[PDB]
Amino acid sequence: HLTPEEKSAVTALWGKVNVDEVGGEALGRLLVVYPWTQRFFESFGDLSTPDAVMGNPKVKAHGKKVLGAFSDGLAHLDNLKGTFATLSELHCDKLHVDPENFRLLGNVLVCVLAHHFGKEFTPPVQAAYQKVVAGVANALAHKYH
């Protein structure tokens, strides 16, 4: 659970986020850093070289959809299990994505936020966003329980 200051600092930073690129960078970095995750995106095409993964227009378009789902999680922090109920069913029952990969993507997003905000992504701001991405990972893995 986020303190009032943590909730304020998170919504504050998020409003400054480029909803068009961050999701793409986060998803792209996941496929380069942990390349076994490329097994769920073979239908996306070019993913061999690192510049191809980032420059891929589908990795960029899909990342935007992933970012949207995190924005939804942020808007409703008290109802994460509910917000990610259809997506938990989708990822767990249809896709068979191991829940460990939700934790990795949340951590890659944290690395992307630090990369875009520099010194504005302070250690308590990161501490707050760690609660968020952990909350989203657990809620997206609820159908496995």
**Which residues bind to a second copy, rule: CB under 8 A?**
135, 138, 145
HEC states along 71-138? HHHHHCHHHHHHHCHHHHHHHHHHHCCCCHHHHHHHHHHHHHHHHHHHHHCCHHHHHHHHHHHHHHHH
Q: Which residues bind ligand HNI (CB under 6 A)?
A: 37, 40-41, 65-66, 69-70, 87, 90-91, 95, 97, 101-102, 105-106, 136-137, 140
105, 92, 94: which is closest to 134 by C-alpha?
Answer: 105
Which of 31, 120 has the CB closer to ligand HEM?
31
Task: DSSP letter for 20, please.
Answer: T
| Footprint on residues 32-51 left by another protein (CB under 8 A) | 32-33, 35-36, 38-39, 48-51
Per CB under 8 A, 1 contacts another protein: no
Half-sphere exposure of 142 (CA within 13 A, CB side): 17
The contact set with another protein (CB under 8 A) reads 25, 28-29, 32-33, 35-36, 38-39, 48-51, 53-54, 96, 98, 100-101, 107, 110-112, 114-115, 117-119, 121, 123-124, 126-127, 130
